[PDB]
Write a protein that binds this ligand. Structure first.
Ligand SMILES: Cc1cc2nc3c(=O)[nH]c(=O)nc-3n(C[C@H](O)[C@H](O)[C@H](O)COP(=O)(O)OP(=O)(O)OC[C@H]3O[C@@H](n4cnc5c(N)ncnc54)[C@H](O)[C@@H]3O)c2cc1C
Ligand SMILES: Cc1cc2nc3c(=O)[nH]c(=O)nc-3n(C[C@H](O)[C@H](O)[C@H](O)COP(=O)(O)OP(=O)(O)OC[C@H]3O[C@@H](n4cnc5c(N)ncnc54)[C@H](O)[C@@H]3O)c2cc1C
Lengths: 584, 584
């Protein structure tokens, strides 16, 4: 127990006011009750609630030479136990607890999902936190408020437009169920106002939340100069430096444009799409990422002539049987695919005009991999080909923080090669680019920094869901990566089609929705992958991610009794394997 | 040992053709290839796929004295290994396997979820099976086809009407999302006509499935006379006996009418509601089971004036905090409650009138427990006050199978006190009254009987969902029983409200949907109960039932990453306890 104590000296030194406590100890309440009465921010850690809380008391007695808890540190200076605190009078203690050397305990570059979460949790454990967020506008001029990609130009509006697309099919279902429905035209502007109304309520909400936690939100861009100070330029344009013990990089990504004539001038991305003045008209999406396919999906169902232009395959990195069934379904309900094919140029012939409500005409050319060129006209070109980490122009050259393929490299505590610089969320090279990951990395990092806990974020078995017109949720390995990792002499795949009961009265096509489990027979038939394609794929999937953290096996799904009538119950009765060739 | 060695003797003797095998072995494959070309139905159990497979290969060596596989039995007669079968030749060989002391290996009284599932899996493993199902009509004369309660008058039509109710609300949601809809009136006749067409499609499906499996379906009523013969009266009244080695009671339940004037004469039950000629009009439901509230729920959203009359409490046996929000929500969107109050009488004032519509008018009065009487008029009275098991007039007095409040009592192998009589589904005293339970119990019983498997059905952690206008799913113990079982300072309750992102734009009311986990701190913070109240509650809940068979703790929900944006992710970040008194 040699350097796991020096790892804890380290967490003690870069914390703020920190109190090692126990739940039943009377002494601890008196010092904590007193810090609250003098408005002293602190963070505490309670060792009766740790399986290893025993080893913490061992380690603390080498650091301090004291045997009991409480043990209290002011930014590394050990103040002592209970009576050492009651011998500092009510104002030399308050004065001593706020000297720092730096303006801030922590500066967070980036106010996204993860920055905001790390900020809120850090302040609740005593930290003086500055949170920087500034939204460099799109080429066509789009910006948004506090909240990051998810809130403004990501999950929240995407899913909301997805739900305006679902209700169109829900409403044609409703006639089979006895309702006489008119269903008329779709008013694009009324929907984008409802959506931007929720966003602004979340802009307001995250901004309120930061003030009530005593986080200094500064609407300014961050750049690193040295490990302990950050350069900030704000709206008005003035530079100011601030000093910090800790730097967190949480800058996310922004969409990529292909290097082709007219891309930035005339195209849009997800950043622009959730705020368009006008129905996009005849649309071309470029790329076959989840963002491209989800956008084509709800745009088609809202009423647009949509065309997707795919360089090669759909959803590279996802299971490709499933990627086939998404695209086959998108394809069977109006979304046209040109593939394989890449754009070469986009020029403007006619221009958008709010003096008539008539959309620009753009013509896009392209190469078809075979050489045949492509040429057609669209009113909107939407580039959805990937996103790039915001690692340029933040000073990582000045401190020599390592990057790999644009992403900040980080250990299992989200720390870089400089021991006081961290990176969380999408700019990490850890985990999927998902906001619940960003939020968890935030909350756990906050409690290691400012309560000295050892909780680490777990990046295995992370669930995802793709909100294409028929949704696709998955956990774990694709069938092709499991077969590669473990060998086909070790993989069994159970599968089945299924027909949501909600679809039989409306006469939607059976043998479309699909469930499959990837099984590693050599490890007690462990469920190493989980895939579902059907309605409400997000809510089907979530619970099973808990069972796979517990190591669920095929035995365990079958022992579980289904809920009838649901889509999710088909996973309690999978029967048919793939090696058997029997029909699914 | 000793006791279990005879337990296997027994399933060998009451089996049909039985083959104990291993998957390594051509010697087994050659015996079974020969049975398949000689059109011999058999059931096999493969001993490599049993964790205890070693103990079978030494138990058999006590019955037979051989250690090798294959080993083959014909209804208890031990024929031997691979060369012992490669004599006999193709015709005295086929004569030995069709010799029986009875007309059937198994007769099943009841063609519901459990019976139908039990029959198919038995036939697939070698049994000569007769399946009896006959539907004695309602007071009003209504009947239905093969399939049992769930297919004809239960889960399937219930949920379809529920989905007609949801789509009405999904359609106002859609105006906030930009659609000029709008919704006209609801045609009851077109909806049940679509519903019964799917029902009929399952009637046909289950009868085809029985014929393709070579079960003799007899649309007749079953009565026991001795352990080994069943009396069958068909449509006519012609009785015929059939003899059987094993009897299964799977006769389900049917709804109870209260003992009051006019109950059977003028009211209806769930058995009638899913087939009604007419829109029910202004309706009264009596009772507060899940069946009463779900029906009350969808009738209301479809357009009816509905009223529920509760002798005491909502959803007796469920968590009653949840039962509160189920009703509080029903009540706040059009359904009227009189409670506490009980029926006394129903008489008729006007009668049907074709086809001037003029629906029957009935007058129901009652007493309010306080004594105050009740009196009013409705066009439909629906009794949802319970269901009673079909154990009268099936002959259990003749062989003396024990019952407790009408339910056939049964052990962990679903056997009664008569060793060749079993009972599955709702006539059990085992488990909740749920279709996936009937099916799983049937399906495991089939292989103890005809593969000599030892798989037992698990009645712990069964998830249920109530499809009220806002749905309610749950697993495990209610909050009130966890405190009884474990004591209140060993339970912590995490909870939170949540707002489905689909509800933000339409401005459906915040702090309505609700999630809570019941935690037993004394057993490593194990999750002993799980409750969610919200949209798509069946699909939210199902996966977590798997996680609770694996012993999920609060730690484990917290380690799991949410799928954003979903309702189910709120169980990955529950934070506020009840003992803390903070807001949810
Ligand atoms: C169209 C789209 C749909 C998506 N749908 C989902 C989904 O359904 N479910 C899911 O889980 N995830 C989804 N995601 C991904 C999710 O949005 C991201 O994973 C999440 O927002 C990342 O959080 P973050 O905090 O790491 O980065 P961000 O949220 O992007 O936060 C970065 C913030 O820092 C700002 N910033 C950048 N540089 C600086 C700088 N030098 N100084 C100061 N501020 C700076 C940025 O302007 C931004 O506000 C989607 C993404 C997109 C683009
Ligand atoms: C309105 C309603 C809604 C429900 N919703 C759900 C739900 O959403 N999810 C869920 O899991 N469960 C639900 N259930 C319960 C589910 O339907 C039952 O638990 C399931 O049907 C029981 O299956 P069973 O095979 O044991 O009996 P049954 O399905 O009832 O079938 C028994 C069959 O045997 C016939 N029979 C009776 N006596 C004889 C006799 N002497 N001889 C020959 N045949 C006989 C009967 O006519 C019947 O057809 C619901 C029930 C009702 C009433």
């Amino acid at each position: 127990s040699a350097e796991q104590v020096e790892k804890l000296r380290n967490k003690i030194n870069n914390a703020a006011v920190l109190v090692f406590a126990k739940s039943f100890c009377p002494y601890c309440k008196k010092v904590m009750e007193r810090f609250n009465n003098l408005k002293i921010p602190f963070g505490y850690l309670d060792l009766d609630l740790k399986k290893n809380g025993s080893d913490y008391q061992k380690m603390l007695q080498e650091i301090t030479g004291r045997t009991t808890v409480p043990q209290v540190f002011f930014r590394g200076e050990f103040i002592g136990g209970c009576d050492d605190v009651m011998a500092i009078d009510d104002d030399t203690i308050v004065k001593k607890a706020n000297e720092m050397k730096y303006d801030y305990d922590m500066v967070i570059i980036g106010g996204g999902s993860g920055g905001l979460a790390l900020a809120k949790e850090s302040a609740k454990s005593g930290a003086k936190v500055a949170l920087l967020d500034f939204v460099v506008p799109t080429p066509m001029g789009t910006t948004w408020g506090l909240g990051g990609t998810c809130v403004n130009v990501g999950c929240i509006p995407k899913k909301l437009m997805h739900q305006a697309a679902l209700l169109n099919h829900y409403m044609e279902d409703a006639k089979s169920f006895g309702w006489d429905v008119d269903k008329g035209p779709h008013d694009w502007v009324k929907m984008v106002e409802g959506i931007q109304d929720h966003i602004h309520a979340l802009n307001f909400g995250y901004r309120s939340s930061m003030m009530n936690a005593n986080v200094k939100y500064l609407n300014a861009l961050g750049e690193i100069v040295d490990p302990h100070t950050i350069k900030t330029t704000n709206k008005q344009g003035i530079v100011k430096n601030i000093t910090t013990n800790t730097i967190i990089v949480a800058t996310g990504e922004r969409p990529r444009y292909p290097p082709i004539p007219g891309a930035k001038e005339y195209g849009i991305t997800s950043d622009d799409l959730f705020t368009l003045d006008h129905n996009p008209g005849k649309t071309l999406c470029v790329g076959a990422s989840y963002v491209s396919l989800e956008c084509a999906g709800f745009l088609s169902s809202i009423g647009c002539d949509v065309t997707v232009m795919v360089r090669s395959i759909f959803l590279r990195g996802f299971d490709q049987q499933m990627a086939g069934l998404i695209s086959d379904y998108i394809a069977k309900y109006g979304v046209k695919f040109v593939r394989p094919c890449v754009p070469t140029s986009v020029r403007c012939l006619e221009e958008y005009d709010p003096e008539s409500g008539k959309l620009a005409i753009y013509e896009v050319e392209g190469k078809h991999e075979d050489g045949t060129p492509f040429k057609d006209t669209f009113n909107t070109v939407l580039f959805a080909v990937g996103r790039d980490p915001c690692t340029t122009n933040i000073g990582l050259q000045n401190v020599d923080v390592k990057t790999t393929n644009g992403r900040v490299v980080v250990d299992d505590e989200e720390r870089t090669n400089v021991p006081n610089i961290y990176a969380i969320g999408d700019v990490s090279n850890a985990g999927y680019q998902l906001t619940p990951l960003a939020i968890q990395a935030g909350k756990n990092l906050a409690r290691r920094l400012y309560t000295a806990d050892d909780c680490r974020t777990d990046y295995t078995n992370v669930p995802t869901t793709v909100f294409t017109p028929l949704e696709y949720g998955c956990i774990g390995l694709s069938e092709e990566n499991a077969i590669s990792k473990f060998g086909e002499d070790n993989i069994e795949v159970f599968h089945s089609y299924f027909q949501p009961l909600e679809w039989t009265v409306p006469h939607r096509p059976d043998n479309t929705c699909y469930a499959k489990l990837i099984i590693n027979k050599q490890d007690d038939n462990r469920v190493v992958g989980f895939h579902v394609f059907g309605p409400n794929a997000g809510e089907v999937t979530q619970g099973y991610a808990v069972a796979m953290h517990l190591g669920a096996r095929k035995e365990d799904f079958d022992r579980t009794i289904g809920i009838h009538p649901t889509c999710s119950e088909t996973f309690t009765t999978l029967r048919v394997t793939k090696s058997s060739g029997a029909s699914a």
